[PDB]
Design an enzyme around this catalytic site. Structure first.
Site, PDB file in Angstrom:
ATOM      1  N   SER A  44       0.770  -1.253   0.000  1.00  0.00           N
ATOM      2  CA  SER A  44       0.000   0.000   0.000  1.00  0.00           C
ATOM      3  C   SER A  44       0.803   1.306   0.000  1.00  0.00           C
ATOM      4  O   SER A  44       0.324   2.338  -0.469  1.00  0.00           O
ATOM      5  CB  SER A  44      -0.967  -0.016   1.161  1.00  0.00           C
ATOM      6  OG  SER A  44      -1.890  -1.084   0.990  1.00  0.00           O
ATOM      7  N   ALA A  45       2.029   1.259   0.516  1.00  0.00           N
ATOM      8  CA  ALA A  45       2.915   2.424   0.563  1.00  0.00           C
ATOM      9  C   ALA A  45       3.232   3.052  -0.806  1.00  0.00           C
ATOM     10  O   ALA A  45       3.625   4.222  -0.854  1.00  0.00           O
ATOM     11  CB  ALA A  45       4.208   2.072   1.297  1.00  0.00           C
TER      12      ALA A  45
END
Length: 429
Positions: free
Chosen positions: A177-178
């Site tokens: 997700s980063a």
């Protein structure tokens, strides 16, 4: 009983200090011996020298040429007990030149904070290992970098290969997700989406492969896509670009090449040649799988969001001024993406544990056996600090990055903001 001897006059190895002058590594006579007064605190960054005072790991190794200096020598007559009897004229008689001293950009107050909060988190979750990087969001200077497990660089001979590994720079992870804020930023920046477009975010298929979120969101704007951390919405935005253009973008963020920070053992990560990508691989990449980078590379990439669209090189040495960087996004784009990312730490967001009392915090979190990640910056409007935390194989009390790496991020970010003397931008609850 009268013996000619060339007596070594060893150079004194340069000192390593923190940004405020706290001494981290120095040599004392015994031959010189290398001393690390703060023990394990800076183990991985600084590393260690071998028995002969040559750098073996870390910055001791990579800064060897400037640190070591130049040994001298003199020719003497000695006796059988070793008493110098005479100093002899010789062109080999040379004065030593001491090593160059190094002032690191790191701050032991932040390093201690990061160190203590990392260890607390790793033990509480009974994790295998963990990493913390703290950057100055405006100059790219590294303010802290710690890994656990660590070792005492004063006694490095008893230290595991696992203890000695500088995971922040050496290990490759799928960011998960980063990576999403970057894809969203690119879409906004290129003008392929805007702030009030609503996307169909129903789960779909690429050929036989499903792209789905955790919950079915029928539609989301760019903000909801950020807030909820939608794989569907992120992959659809990436899909408005061709493979080569996405690839070029990832590459220019430093994915798949070596950073050349000056640390030894840097991983290059993984960016597969765009000519080989399937649509589905492009999709999973937009939510952080099928490509890889180190935590340090991830943290660096975030400087493009914090330094107004301009990607900075990282520094381990104290800088007087921000290095020139490379523009990735319009200042306009970075600013609006920062505002978007505050919604992940506010209620409704995926990373509420990263909320810091008195600040707006932009963050992403996700679970990269697992690797739990949390990364963010504050104050979000005018960022000062980037904090990145990774916990490796959490075993107890949660798996998710928001719950395992979230709490230490909050402590490290709050402590850091306070240590740096940055005022709250909103009333404290």
């Amino acid at each position: 009983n009268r013996i000619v001897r060339t007596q070594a006059l060893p150079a004194t190895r340069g000192t390593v200090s923190d940004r405020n002058g706290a001494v981290l590594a120095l040599s004392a006579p015994t031959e010189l011996k290398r001393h690390y007064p703060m023990g394990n605190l800076f183990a991985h960054v600084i590393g260690f020298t071998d028995i002969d005072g040559k750098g073996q790991e870390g910055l001791e190794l990579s800064l060897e040429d400037s640190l070591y200096g130049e040994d001298g020598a003199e020719v003497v007559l000695r006796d059988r007990q070793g008493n110098i009897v005479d100093s002899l004229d010789s062109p080999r008689n040379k004065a030593p030149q001491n090593g160059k001293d190094i002032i690191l950009s790191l701050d032991q107050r932040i390093q201690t904070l990061a160190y203590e909060e990392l260890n607390k988190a790793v033990e509480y979750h009974q994790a295998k290992a963990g990493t913390v990087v703290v950057l100055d969001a405006r100059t790219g200077e590294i303010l802290a970098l710690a890994n656990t497990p660590a070792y005492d660089p004063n006694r490095p001979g008893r230290a595991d290969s696992e203890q000695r590994r500088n995971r922040a720079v050496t290990d490759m992870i799928e960011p998960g997700s980063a990576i999403k804020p970057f894809v969203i930023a690119k879409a906004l920046d290129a003008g392929k989406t805007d702030l009030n477009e609503r996307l169909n975010t129903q789960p779909y298929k690429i050929g036989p492969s499903p792209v789905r979120d955790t919950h079915v969101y029928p539609s989301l704007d760019v903000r909801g896509i950020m807030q909820k951390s939608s794989n569907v919405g992120t992959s659809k935005l990436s899909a408005r670009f061709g493979a080569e253009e996405m690839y070029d973008f990832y590459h220019e963020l430093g994915i798949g090449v070596r950073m050349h920070s000056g640390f030894p053992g840097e991983t290059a990560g993984l960016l597969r040649n765009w000519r080989r990508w399937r649509p589905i691989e492009q999709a999973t990449m937009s939510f952080g799988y099928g490509l890889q980078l180190s935590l340090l590379q991830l943290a660096r990439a975030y400087t493009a969001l914090t330094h107004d669209g301009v990607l900075l090189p990282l520094s381990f040495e104290k800088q007087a001024v921000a290095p020139q960087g490379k523009r990735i996004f319009k200042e306009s784009t970075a600013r609006e993406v920062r505002n978007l990312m505050v919604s992940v730490t506010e209620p409704g967001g995926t990373g509420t544990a990263g909320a810091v009392d008195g600040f707006d915090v932009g963050a992403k979190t996700g679970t990269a056996k697992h690797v739990a990640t949390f990364i963010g910056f504050a104050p979000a409007k005018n960022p000062r600090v980037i904090v990145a935390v990774t916990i490796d194989e959490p075993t107890a009390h949660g798996y998710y990055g928001g719950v395992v790496a979230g709490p230490p991020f909050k402590k490290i970010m709050g402590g850091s903001l306070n240590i740096l003397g940055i005022s709250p931008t909103k009333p404290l609850t």
